Design a binder for this molecule. Sequence first.
Ligand SMILES: Nc1ncnc2c1ncn2[C@@H]1O[C@H](COP(=O)(O)OP(=O)(O)O)[C@@H](O)[C@H]1O
Ligand SMILES: NC(=O)NCCC[C@H](N)C(=O)O
Ligand SMILES: [Mg+2]
Length: 356
Amino acid sequence: VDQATLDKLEAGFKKLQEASDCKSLLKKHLTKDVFDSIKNKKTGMGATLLDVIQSGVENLDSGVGIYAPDAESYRTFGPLFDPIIDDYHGGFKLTDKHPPKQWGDINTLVGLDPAGQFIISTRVRCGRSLQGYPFNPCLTAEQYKEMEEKVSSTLSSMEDELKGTYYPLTGMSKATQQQLIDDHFLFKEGDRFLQTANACRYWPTGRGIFHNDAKTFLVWVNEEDHLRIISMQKGGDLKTVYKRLVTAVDNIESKLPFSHDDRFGFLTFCPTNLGTTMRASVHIQLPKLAKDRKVLEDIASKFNLQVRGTRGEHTESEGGVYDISNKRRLGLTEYQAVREMQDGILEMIKMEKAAA
Ligand SMILES: Nc1ncnc2c1ncn2[C@@H]1O[C@H](COP(=O)(O)OP(=O)(O)O)[C@@H](O)[C@H]1O
Ligand SMILES: NC(=O)NCCC[C@H](N)C(=O)O
Ligand SMILES: [Mg+2]
């Protein structure tokens, strides 16, 4: 680690201390001891502590504030990652290891809202990293192009329900891009948390989206993770949505090598996405319970759920529509993660019906 970087870290640490109302896990867990213990360390790819905490230093409204530039970072900077990961995922000890992949019995999942008055749409995503490629901040432009080639070529072999077409962001019309984002299908462009993590270099080179014609099965290429594999549709038929995701991921896994860690399960760029990498969500209206989004969030938290705005994290609810999902992804199985959403949403709906 050089001097210019040390200077910036000391100043960043200072900034976090002075931000009396900053509530990120970065601020909470980057103690002086922790800070001093790892600030002079560097990975084989040259990732430093600055590359890890910079997004959280610059964006004090971060909930977490850190990312892993490469896989090594998770251990090189363990003293910071470890407490943050344990905290976010609701208990995960130094000696704990994420369980083996287990989709569980899909037939035990139910329709989340049969009368159709609360839930708008249901979505399940996972993320994967390609073996042999580091995370965004360590990628070159050429690697983005190489990965895009590997993934798009693989997805051309999908068949039946999953058969579809790859659409590069490069050459994509502004109108087509904006509509896909508005309809909740395509990742947004220009995220300040990702940008400051240097996760968006060379944009839009290598970025794009694959989907079947119905857009119930989608794969994001080279956004936050190398792949995000998504199943979604209108309504509350979680069983179908989840079954389609399982089929797609099992099939893609036989073709592409993805990075998996004995302790952290599937590796991802953000520590919140480790393990199952799974975020199962609904877009839902709960007018009585949502009469104050902070009350809504307090209720959700007891069910281990997270509340986001309509256009994703770091956005507001529009027209009473909230994104509610399992928060935890690591230290529980895929089945357990999706069941936390199912169970929590079914009960929150019951509470809404009962509320005055
Ligand atoms: N249950 C859902 N139904 C429809 N669209 C959804 C649902 N949950 C999330 N989305 C959309 O997914 C996109 C990604 O949002 P983000 O909050 O960035 O999720 P991720 O963890 O998938 O990256 C946004 O456009 C958001 O509207
Ligand atoms: N909504 C979320 O919890 N997103 C995961 C972390 C995103 C961003 N780096 C943050 O810390 O807010
Ligand atoms: Mg996202």
